[PDB]
Amino acid sequence: GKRLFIIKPSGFYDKRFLKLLRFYILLTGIPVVIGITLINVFIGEAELAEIPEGYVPEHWEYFKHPIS
Amino acid sequence: SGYTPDEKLRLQQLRELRRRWLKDQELSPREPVLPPR
């Protein structure tokens, strides 16, 4: 009636790759960020005591973040 | 001077083909696109 037909190279392959990329990062993007959120909102990071009288720790218990 | 009548006739068949092509390129099936949803 009024409008011509535009020429396009291709769209399907590109939209398919972008949806696959965002989805297969999203598959463990959301659970990882919800995991780090539940970690620093439930269990605590740490606090800052000193070394008591002759209680030698393991090689851990020296770090702030609990997953560290 | 001008053209040759051979080039004039060749030009006229290109008028035939060009106008039919560009009449094709203006789509109107009364629905250009169709979204699936």
| CA B2 – CA B8 distance, rounded (Å) | 10
Distance from CA of A22 to the nearest CA of B (A): 22
Task: Tell me the residues of B at the A interface, defined by beta carbons under 8 Å apart.
Answer: 25-28, 32
Let me know: does A68 contact A44? Beta carbons within 8 Å. Answer: no
Q: Give the technique used to solve this structure.
A: cryo-EM
Distance from CA of B17 to the nearest CA of A (A): 17
| CA A63 – CA A47 distance, rounded (Å) | 10
Chain B contact for A64 (CB, 8 A cutoff)? no
Resolution of the structure, angstroms:
4.2
Place of tokens 């068949």: B13
Dihedral (CA of A39, A44, A50, A53) sign: negative
| Nearest by Cα to A45 from A65, A30, A63, A16 | A65
| CA A51 – CA A57 distance, rounded (Å) | 9
List Cα–Cα distances, B7 to B3, B21, B30, in angstroms: 6, 20, 39
